[PDB]
Amino acid sequence: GPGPGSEAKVTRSCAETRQVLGARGYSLNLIPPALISGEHLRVCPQEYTCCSSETEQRLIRETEATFRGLVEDSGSFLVHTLAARHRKFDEFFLEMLSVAQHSLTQLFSHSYGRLYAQHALIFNGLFSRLRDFYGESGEGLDDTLADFWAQLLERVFPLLHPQYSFPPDYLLCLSRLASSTDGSLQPFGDSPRRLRLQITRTLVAARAFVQGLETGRNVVSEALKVPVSEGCSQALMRLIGCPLCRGVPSLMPCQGFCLNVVRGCLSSRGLEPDWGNYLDGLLILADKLQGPFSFELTAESIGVKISEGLMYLQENSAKVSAQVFQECGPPDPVPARNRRAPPPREEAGRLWSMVTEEERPTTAAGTNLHRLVWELRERLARMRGFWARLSLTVCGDSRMAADASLEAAPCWTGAGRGRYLPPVVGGSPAEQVNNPELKVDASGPDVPTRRRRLQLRAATARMKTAALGHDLDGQDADEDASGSGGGQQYADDWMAGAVAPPARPPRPPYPPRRDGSGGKGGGGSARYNQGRSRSGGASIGFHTQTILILSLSALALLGPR
């Protein structure tokens, strides 16, 4: 194949190797000027060499460091963007929570006057619980939304009818009436039904999205904590450092040889098949938050849904009075007057009024929401192939080292030169079992890969279910249904140690695993500890999150006390 021209030089000259590695800070006395009268090579073929064993080991470490730099920088970007998506999403929610709250204060102070002003804490208290629910700390928002209307009927009604006496029996009656006469649509119309349904189902869809982004952030952050195997460091030495130790720095690796080496180095790709399903859960959910579960629309609509209920309260005041002064007790005599009511009192200070509507935010607020869901949708989708791109990037960079040539021309194949022909395996560790250059047994994926793969699926199920507007009190079904899911299994370490008269610290006979371990003390889900297990106990380390708890058994040795 075609390639660049070369200068005639002494065959396998190690002086040239010294020029290349001396620039990297290698001690010059570790590299002879000509091939050493020994082989000294263990990872590279065992032949005469320019590398002392120290030089060979330095190259293994240097190539491993170069490898890690290309993976970690691309991972730091993904972690950074996941944090950026998270922060940007939360800031508009916090903003609209505050903007709606002020606009409601302006709306109700003028439209309802003292009826609102004396009770503003109740209306603003709701907003604090909208935020607490968003953070999963105030999940009892549904009861807060029910109590909101009970408090209003208890406290606004006596101000509408202040001629009547309201002992606590009537006040408590008014608070109960709201729950029984909302069924008849009298004290607030159907507004309580509108308010309670829209807010809760929108917030769980948004909360699921926040939880998903955090799940991804923590999945990727620990995926980079998967160590580089010693087999990878040796395969990387075969990739780059070996022809240099043979005194030929011009030979650089075939892309197909490289891809197999790098794919074997990346066991973290066990996260990949659930990474796609996890991002699909976010993407479907993101589309739902654009309109029917748009929180920014919901936030403003709170004002209208409450104002409608308070208008029904004033309109149906006579109808509510008919219930209050029969169910709570008889009417109070009052100094009612006939003929004509007095004219209303006016104020010397200019009074103002305003009206809110259930319209989506406009101009900058509307376009920021539109851009938010565009940035969330495109950036998440593009990073779906991240785990595959890790393998392609490292070997694309290695191709460009020899950009003046093609693999049609001879390239380095680990132990020699030519064109690489064996196949390149796919992704996940399952395909790395078939890897011809760096074989990896898929039976033992790394701990972050095992634990975080589970988290991706749990998030997937919740986000797709919440996309329907379903509460997050559902299940981890992959059918978006109420069927049960998750569970997993756990094992523990039983230990025994006499408390008295001997004071022996606890030690296992054996940890009873699913199979009972060597002591055969198990039954699948059952775990048994046998033998001289007096003064026994157990240590349980949960596998889904690092949590460790202890227990003890009342089997103290005691002796002939």
Side-chain angles (χ1 to χ4, degrees):
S6 64
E7 296 183 350
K9 296 185 183 184
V10 177
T11 308
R12 298 179 72 184
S13 183
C14 300
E16 191 178 359
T17 304
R18 184 186 287 186
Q19 292 176 297
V20 176
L21 291 176
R24 303 185 195 181
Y26 282 61
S27 180
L28 304 175
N29 296 313
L30 299 174
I31 303 160
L35 291 167
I36 200 161
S37 192
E39 299 107 287
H40 307 284
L41 291 173
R42 296 167 289 177
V43 178
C44 306
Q46 191 181 306
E47 292 185 59
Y48 302 104
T49 194
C50 304
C51 291
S52 66
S53 61
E54 191 182 323
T55 307
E56 191 184 9
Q57 291 176 179
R58 284 172 179 272
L59 268 168
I60 293 164
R61 294 282 87 82
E62 187 177 58
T63 312
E64 189 187 306
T66 305
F67 178 80
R68 290 173 63 180
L70 298 171
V71 177
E72 290 178 5
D73 188 45
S74 67
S76 68
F77 179 83
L78 182 51
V79 175
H80 179 84
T81 53
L82 282 162
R85 290 182 196 89
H86 180 276
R87 177 66 179 175
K88 194 181 179 67
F89 185 83
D90 293 325
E91 285 175 298
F92 291 111
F93 273 63
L94 290 170
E95 187 183 6
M96 288 298 291
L97 276 168
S98 68
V99 172
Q101 189 175 180
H102 287 86
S103 66
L104 294 224
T105 303
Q106 294 176 297
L107 179 66
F108 301 142
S109 59
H110 294 94
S111 66
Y112 301 109
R114 297 183 185 181
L115 303 176
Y116 170 78
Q118 295 174 230
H119 303 123
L121 298 173
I122 301 171
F123 295 84
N124 292 328
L126 183 62
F127 281 91
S128 68
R129 293 295 302 276
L130 296 176
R131 189 181 65 83
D132 292 337
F133 186 98
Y134 187 72
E136 217 177 6
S137 64
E139 69 182 357
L141 182 67
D142 285 305
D143 292 308
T144 307
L145 285 159
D147 290 339
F148 176 78
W149 299 100
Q151 292 172 77
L152 286 173
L153 189 54
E154 182 177 5
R155 303 187 186 184
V156 180
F157 185 89
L159 296 178
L160 294 171
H161 302 281
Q163 298 189 300
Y164 291 85
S165 299
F166 293 90
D169 293 307
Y170 275 67
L171 295 173
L172 291 169
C173 182
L174 282 165
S175 69
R176 294 191 298 272
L177 272 170
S179 67
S180 64
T181 62
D182 282 350
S184 61
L185 304 171
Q186 299 299 300
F188 302 109
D190 75 314
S191 300
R193 304 185 188 185
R194 295 181 181 180
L195 191 74
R196 193 175 184 177
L197 292 171
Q198 188 65 50
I199 295 171
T200 306
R201 305 300 128 83
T202 302
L203 272 170
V204 295
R207 191 170 72 190
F209 192 83
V210 176
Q211 293 173 311
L213 288 174
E214 290 295 271
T215 303
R217 188 180 60 76
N218 288 300
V219 169
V220 179
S221 63
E222 295 190 358
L224 300 172
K225 300 180 191 178
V226 174
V228 178
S229 64
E230 72 300 307
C232 175
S233 70
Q234 292 180 351
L236 288 172
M237 181 65 193
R238 294 191 294 274
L239 188 69
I240 299 170
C242 291
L244 185 59
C245 288
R246 297 171 71 88
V248 186
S250 65
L251 294 170
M252 292 180 273
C254 305
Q255 196 180 315
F257 179 88
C258 180
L259 284 166
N260 280 306
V261 170
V262 173
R263 290 167 185 268
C265 293
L266 298 169
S267 63
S268 63
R269 297 189 66 174
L271 298 168
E272 193 175 24
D274 288 311
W275 184 247
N277 281 283
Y278 152 78
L279 289 171
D280 289 339
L282 277 169
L283 289 167
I284 296 162
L285 186 56
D287 290 338
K288 291 289 188 182
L289 295 170
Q290 298 190 28
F293 302 101
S294 179
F295 182 78
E296 303 191 0
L297 174 62
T298 303
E300 294 186 61
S301 72
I302 292 168
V304 181
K305 288 179 173 69
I306 295 170
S307 67
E308 286 179 304
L310 293 171
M311 288 302 290
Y312 286 123
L313 182 67
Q314 296 188 120
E315 188 183 5
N316 296 317
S317 294
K319 301 176 187 173
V320 175
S321 297
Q323 299 180 297
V324 174
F325 302 111
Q326 296 187 83
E327 190 179 305
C328 310
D332 194 27
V334 294
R337 295 186 182 276
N338 70 324
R339 301 179 182 178
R340 193 178 184 179
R345 192 179 191 275
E346 297 188 325
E347 300 303 317
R350 186 175 179 180
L351 298 172
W352 306 95
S353 64
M354 65 177 280
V355 179
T356 56
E357 297 299 334
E358 301 186 307
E359 189 67 65
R360 293 180 292 178
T362 60
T363 62
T367 53
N368 277 330
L369 179 61
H370 188 82
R371 190 183 296 102
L372 179 67
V373 300
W374 186 91
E375 289 177 6
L376 288 168
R377 190 177 184 178
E378 296 303 307
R379 297 174 183 178
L380 287 173
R382 292 171 184 178
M383 300 300 285
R384 186 173 180 174
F386 179 77
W387 306 108
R389 285 161 59 187
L390 286 175
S391 300
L392 297 171
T393 306
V394 177
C395 298
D397 292 334
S398 70
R399 185 197 178 280
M400 294 300 288
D403 192 30
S405 65
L406 299 173
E407 65 176 39
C411 47
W412 188 251
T413 57
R417 68 182 179 87
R419 186 173 184 175
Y420 187 82
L421 300 174
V424 179
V425 297
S428 299
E431 294 301 309
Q432 309 314 307
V433 179
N434 299 309
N435 193 310
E437 308 311 315
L438 183 59
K439 191 180 181 183
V440 179
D441 193 350
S443 64
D446 290 88
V447 183
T449 305
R450 302 203 306 272
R451 294 192 178 194
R452 294 292 177 184
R453 187 175 182 174
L454 297 173
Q455 299 301 309
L456 292 168
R457 293 188 65 83
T460 303
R462 292 186 181 185
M463 292 185 288
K464 291 182 179 180
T465 306
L468 302 173
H470 195 286
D471 289 308
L472 279 164
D473 294 307
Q475 294 293 299
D476 292 326
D478 291 305
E479 298 183 349
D480 301 338
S482 64
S484 61
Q488 304 300 305
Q489 66 181 295
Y490 306 98
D492 70 1
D493 184 25
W494 281 63
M495 298 190 282
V499 180
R504 299 182 184 181
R507 295 291 185 267
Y510 58 93
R513 305 303 190 190
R514 186 185 179 87
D515 74 310
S517 195
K520 309 299 182 183
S525 64
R527 297 183 296 277
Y528 306 101
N529 189 260
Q530 300 185 76
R532 298 183 184 181
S533 60
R534 290 183 181 274
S535 309
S539 184
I540 302 162
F542 292 91
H543 312 324
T544 55
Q545 186 179 310
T546 308
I547 300 166
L548 185 69
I549 63 168
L550 301 175
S551 62
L552 295 172
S553 298
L555 297 171
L557 185 67
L558 298 172
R561 189 181 184 277

